[PDB]
């Protein structure tokens, strides 16, 4: 879900 | 009243509130900054920036690049569909879980829009020490996910  | 008709659904407005603030913030730095250009806020601690995340952290998993755009987008879809169903079952009065579920749902859709529309995720928050350590850039959607996930971990105690 997060950017990275 | 009419609030009993929808039954814990209006908490989605918190999720909608996160998505708009995440997309309106990414639009600003993408227009005022060149790629990797820094805007120094604190000369050693905090600075705005502009970076595109293609998922190079997990580049050790394949002999090519570009798959992170589609696999990571697929994960957010499955997780998002489970959250809304979980939110609907939530009994009236469980405010801690309601606000917490709506936070991670918004931050997931924000970065999802990035991977589907653009080819990457926009990051503009560069925290660091002087030159000995640089923390990876993130955005508001990552902040809503991290805060919402912390609330889940500290739930039953
Ligand atoms: C309920 C109130 C609203 C809560 C929501 C706003 C709160 C913002 C304040 C602190 C959040 C700190 C966020 C720090 C998160 C950094 C970790 C992170 O973003 O992950 C990096 C990413 O994985 C790299 O790609
Ligand atoms: C960062 C962004 C801030 C996150 C939102 C923070 C607080 C909620 C502010 C008020 C939002 C109104 C939601 C309350 C609600 O609609 O809940 C009704 C529910 O149906 C009753 O059972
Ligand atoms: C650019 C993106 C803009 C984002 C917005 C697109 C338009 C969304 C409109 C309707 C769907 C509503 C989705 C959220 C539904 C919340 C649940 C609800 O409707 O609550 C019932 C009652 O109205 C509460 O008091
Ligand atoms: C409150 C609002 C919630 C927001 C919910 C998140 C938004 C949903 C994600 C995308 C919608 C647009 C879909 C666009 C379809 C992209 C088609 C595609 O697969 O990519 C094409 C690519 O450009 C090759 O040319």
Residue numbers in the entry:
A (entry chain E): 201 to 204
B (entry chain A): 2 to 158
The article reads:
Responding to this critical need, we introduce here a fully automated method for collecting, selecting, and merging data from hundreds to thousands of in meso-grown microcrystals. This approach boosts the collective phasing signal of many tiny crystals to a level where de novo phasing of highly challenging membrane protein targets becomes not only possible but also fast and high-throughput. We refer to it as the in meso in situ serial crystallography—experimental phasing (IMISX-EP) method. IMISX-EP has three components: (1) in meso crystallization (and in situ soaking where appropriate), (2) fast, automated grid scanning, and serial data collection in situ, and (3) real-time data processing and selection of data sets followed by structure solution.
The first demonstration of IMISX-EP was carried out using the most popular experimental phasing method, SAD phasing, with the Se-Met labeled proteins, PepTSt and LspA. The second example of Se-SAD phasing proved to be a particularly challenging case study for serial crystallography because the target protein, LspA, was incompletely Se-Met labelled. The average Se-Met incorporation was estimated at 59% based on the refined Se anomalous scattering signal. In this instance, the high-throughput feature of the IMISX-EP method proved invaluable enabling diffraction data to be collected from 974 LspA crystals in 32 IMISX wells. The final data set derived from 497 crystals.
